[PDB]
Amino acid sequence: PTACRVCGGGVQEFLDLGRQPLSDRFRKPDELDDEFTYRLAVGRCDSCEMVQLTEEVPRDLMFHEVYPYHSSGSSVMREHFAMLARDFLATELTGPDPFIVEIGCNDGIMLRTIQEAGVRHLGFEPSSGVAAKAREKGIRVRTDFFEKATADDVRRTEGPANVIYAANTLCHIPYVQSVLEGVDALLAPDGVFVFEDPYLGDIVAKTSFDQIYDQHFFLFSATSVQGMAQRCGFELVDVQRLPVHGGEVRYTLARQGSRTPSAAVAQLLAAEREQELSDMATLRAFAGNVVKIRDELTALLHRLRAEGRSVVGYGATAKSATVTNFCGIGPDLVHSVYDTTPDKQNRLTPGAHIPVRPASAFSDPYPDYALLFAWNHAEEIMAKEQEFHQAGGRWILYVPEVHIR
Numbered sequence: 526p527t528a529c530r531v532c533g534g535g536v537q538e539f540l541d542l543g544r545q546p547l548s549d550r551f552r553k554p555d556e557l558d559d560e561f562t563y564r565l566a567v568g569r570c571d572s573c574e575m576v577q578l579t580e581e582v583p584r585d586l587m588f589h590e591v592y593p594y595h596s597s598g599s600s601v602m603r604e605h606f607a608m609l610a611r612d613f614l615a616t617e618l619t620g621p622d623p624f625i626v627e628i629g630c631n632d633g634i635m636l637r638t639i640q641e642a643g644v645r646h647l648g649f650e651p652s653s654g655v656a657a658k659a660r661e662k663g664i665r666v667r668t669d670f671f672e673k674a675t676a677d678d679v680r681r682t683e684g685p686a687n688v689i690y691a692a693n694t695l696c697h698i699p700y701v702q703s704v705l706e707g708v709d710a711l712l713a714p715d716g717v718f719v720f721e722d723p724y725l726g727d728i729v730a731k732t733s734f735d736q737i738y739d740q741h742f743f744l745f746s747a748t749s750v751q752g753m754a755q756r757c758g759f760e761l762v763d764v765q766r767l768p769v770h771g772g773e774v775r776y777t778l779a780r781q782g783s784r785t786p787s788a789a790v791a792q793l794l795a796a797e798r799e800q801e802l803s804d805m806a807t808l809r810a811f812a813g814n815v816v817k818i819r820d821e822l823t824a825l826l827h828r829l830r831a832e833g834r835s836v837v838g839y840g841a842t843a844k845s846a847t848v849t850n851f852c853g854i855g856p857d858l859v860h861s862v863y864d865t866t867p868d869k870q871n872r873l874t875p876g877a878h879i880p881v882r883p884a885s886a887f888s889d890p891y892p893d894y895a896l897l898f899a900w901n902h903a904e905e906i907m908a909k910e911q912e913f914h915q916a917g918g919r920w921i922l923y924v925p926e927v928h929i930r
């Protein structure tokens with residue numbers, strides 16, 4: 526039985542994805558085939574409605590010098606964060622001498638615009654190789670985890686932050702209480718803590734179970750974020766839905782009664798209550814659809830092999846680990862996975878051990894099918910891969926349902 530990371534309440538499981546490897550550990554073909562596994566399963570707190578995993582992977586197993594994800598590899602995301610940065614420069618960072626702190630700045634995808642504006646800033650990025658890529662752009666970065674203590678250090682030496690921002694980062698952090706204590710110590714009395722992460726509403730609507738893997742500890746909703754804020758002295762004052770990463774919410778927290786919540790907060794809370802998003806029965810129905818997609822996807826891939834049709838994957842996403850290991854998909858069904866990330870090329874995917882090859886290798890003669898694990902990047906990827914589809918190759922998607930197009 527598992528205690529809620531936010532409130533200490535009881536977490537009831539509704540989905541068990543089985544033994545999983547680390548999502549971003551790509552081994553060389555010669556490397557011995559052991560690896561760390563953990564049980565991936567998800568539950569909902571009874572008190573605060575926080576959806577969360579029931580086993581944590583230690584932070585240092587996930588975030589360290591070989592973290593292979595470099596945010597700046599997507600043009601869509603580069604544009605997304607530039608705009609977010611400009612939006613902040615125009616609103617929250619108009620002070621004299623404003624200060625913005627980003628938790629999980631990675632290769633500096635967001636902070637580059639802040640630095641280029643001459644605004645004082647600090648990235649926390651415990652993963653030293655991406656941290657280094659950010660410093661190369663001139664960005665000020667601390668190779669440390671953000672938590673209560675390092676936030677106190679930063680308050681002490683740099684004074685309060687007008688904005689603390691985290692993208693695709695807070696949901697990676699089981700110790701959200703120490704984070705929030707750090708925000709409390711660091712943030713200006715009139716500041717904002719803004720974070721954006723994959724949205725439970727979108728996961729449930731699209732049955733995108735591949736959004737569940739080791740680094741996604743929390744699947745936030747407005748209902749559970751409002752509860753978490755309230756419980757720590759903050760308040761949810763705005764929400765914005767975002768289409769990136771398969772569907773996200775950007776949550777804006779201010780200290781309690783410092784600002785008036787936008788109409789958008791009540792409206793989303795009401796949609797979720799109306800749709801019974803976080804009712805155990807809804808989440809269990811989602812889990813039932815998860816199994817259906819597994820069963821349909823494997824039936825398709827085995828049918829393809831029996832009809833002599835070649836299948837590869839496209840995008841060696843962290844997400845794809847959950848798919849290949851839960852579904853039992855390896856090299857006998859999907860021969861290679863094509864990917865743009867140098868640190869993942871000439872390696873095997875975790876658990877399933879499918880060879881990863883450079884995307885530049887996905888070329889004539891094309892395979893018959895490409896299983897699109899990077900389905901959140903469909904438009905960006907398919908625009909670069911017109912020749913494949915023109916030649917008659919087809920994509921296999923499993924979100925929101927198994928289908929070919």
Ligand SMILES: Cc1cn([C@H]2C[C@H](O)[C@@H](COP(=O)(O)OP(=O)(O)O[C@@H]3C[C@](C)(N)C(=O)[C@@H](C)O3)O2)c(=O)[nH]c1=O
Nearest residue numbers: 594599693740840841842843844864865866899902906
């Ligand atoms: C755009 C594009 C990507 N690709 C390849 C590159 C990447 O390996 C992967 C895409 O991964 P993408 O869906 O962005 O992140 P992943 O699920 O891994 O998830 C990661 C892990 C992390 C930090 N924990 C997180 O939360 C999100 C933000 O990112 O796909 C191409 O080959 N061609 C392309 O044109």
Ligand SMILES: Nc1ncnc2c1ncn2[C@@H]1O[C@H](CSCC[C@H](N)C(=O)O)[C@@H](O)[C@H]1O
Nearest residue numbers: 588596628629631649652670671692693694
């Ligand atoms: N406690 C913590 N403080 C700051 N960053 C952290 C952290 N725990 C993990 N991270 C970093 O959080 C990042 C999650 S990946 C998301 C990166 C980027 N913000 C983007 O949206 O694409 C990784 O670079 C990881 O090393």
Ligand SMILES: [Zn+2]
Nearest residue numbers: 529532570573
């Ligand atoms: Zn709780």
